[PDB]
Amino acid sequence: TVIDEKINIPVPLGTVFSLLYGDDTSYIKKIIENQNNFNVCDIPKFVNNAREITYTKKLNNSFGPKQTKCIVTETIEHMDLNSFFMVKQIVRSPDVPYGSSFSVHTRFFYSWGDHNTTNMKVVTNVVWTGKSMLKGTIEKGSIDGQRSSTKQLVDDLKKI
Ligand SMILES: CC(C)[C@@H](C)/C=C/[C@@H](C)[C@H]1CC[C@H]2C3=CC=C4C[C@@H](O)CC[C@]4(C)[C@H]3CC[C@]12C
Numbered sequence: 001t002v003i004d005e006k007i008n009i010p011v012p013l014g015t016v017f018s019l020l021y022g023d024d025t026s027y028i029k030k031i032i033e034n035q036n037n038f039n040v041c042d043i044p045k046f047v048n049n050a051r052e053i054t055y056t057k058k059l060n061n062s063f064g065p066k067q068t069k070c071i072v073t074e075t076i077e078h079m080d081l082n083s084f085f086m087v088k089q090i091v092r093s094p095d096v097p098y099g100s101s102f103s104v105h106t107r108f109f110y111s112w113g114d115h116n117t118t119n120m121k122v123v124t125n126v127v128w129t130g131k132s133m134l135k136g137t138i139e140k141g142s143i144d145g146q147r148s149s150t151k152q153l154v155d156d157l158k159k160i
Contacts, residue, residue: 004154012116013110
């Protein structure tokens with residue numbers, strides 16, 4: 001469930017918001033392009049605190065499909081204008097075994113830190129809409145790669 005409990009971003013809350021979710025989508029597009037993905041759509045601005053992002057993810061697993069599409073729903077859930085905000089991703093990947101029976105939900109918690117730093121926690125969980133003996137492989141499939149995805153995102157986020 002709890003991917004990363006406390007990373008610290010040496011940049012203010014409002015700028016981390018702008019850098020990952022601002023109306024200039026070029027940073028997040030570079031971020032997303034760096035996580036083993038291709039055929040990335042043109043990254044939309046948020047409208048009504050929601051935006052859709054599509055791409056194909058290359059997989060190196062035991063023997064999944066070894067690539068799958070991803071239809072990602074990204075929404076800004078909570079905005080306390082000074083102390084914290086939170087973004088929630090719902091990620092569908094129809095091409096994998098038992099796709100359309102689940103989605104991956106990841107919450108990105110960003111909070112005002114000391115001398116106006118930003119610390120983030122990342123929490124995910126699979127929501128199920130169908131039975132599947134694969135349940136516990138997908139569940140730890142989601143957690144495992146999300147762990148990797150967060151590592152690249154904070155790795156690229158600090159560089160700038
Ligand atoms: C045996 C097979 C069927 C197993 C391994 C399939 C695992 C899939 C479902 C996993 C592996 C990589 C995972 C994956 C990696 C990284 C991210 C980035 C994150 O920001 C949203 C979720 C997302 C997109 C997830 C979704 C679920 C994926 C695509």
